[PDB]
Chains A and B, each alone.
Chain A
């Protein structure tokens, strides 16, 4: 089924967020969200996202991943939101048939991991996730446990948590 998004009260914001220290390449090493996830799936492959901070304090955000036979890219702009560490998708008013998103950096140490919360609407359909980012692809058990704990705190069952499989194609 479809779990409702937690209130923002339950989503910490990283105190004193430093946009220029969050810049750079991250691997998506965990994700928990309210979308379905069935068991005869192909495993979800790890991909990377590069946050490039601009002068104007927006990020150019580029993701790269591996499909079945080719590398894929996705590029978009995140602009600052209401508090440091919060961003929204895109520079101008929601283009005719568009997506909108809120992004909140919950925690990060900049040089190892980050947990970032996303609420997305697309074609009037709502979803949310928490993404666990790493500077490297290796995810150790204590951090997996902390992410499972955090995801439960937002109302997500274990079966809505995935740790993407590390791969070498495209993302290095």
Chain B
């Protein structure tokens, strides 16, 4: 799934 999987997760999608 996500490239950006930590932090504010999903905030881009």
Residues of A within 8 A of B (CB): 28, 31, 33, 35, 44-45, 47, 49, 63, 65-67, 72, 74, 76, 78, 89, 99, 101, 103, 116, 118, 120, 122, 127, 129, 131
A98 to chain B, nearest CB (A): 8
**Total number of residue pairs linking A and B with CB closer than 8 Å:** 55
A35 to B4, CA, bound (A): 13
Q: Report how many residues on chain B are interfacial, defined by Cβ distance under 8 Å.
A: 10
* Pair B6/A129 contact, Cβ less than 8 Å: yes
Pairwise interchain contact B8-A103, C-beta atoms closer than 8 A: yes
Scan residues 1-13 of chain B and give those whose CB is less than 8 A from a CB of chain A.
3-12
DSSP class of A's interface residues: helix, strand, loop or mixed?
strand
Provide the bound-state CA to CA distance between A67 and B11, in Å: 17
> Interface of B with A (CB < 8 Å)?
3-12
CB-based nearest B residue for A31: B6
Residues of chain B within 8 A of A78, CB atoms compared: 8
The answer to whether B7 touches A129 (Cβ under 8 A) is yes
Q: Are B3 and A65 in contact (CB under 8 A)?
A: yes
The answer to whether B7 touches A118 (Cβ under 8 A) is yes
Distance in angstroms from B6 CB to nearest chain A CB is 4
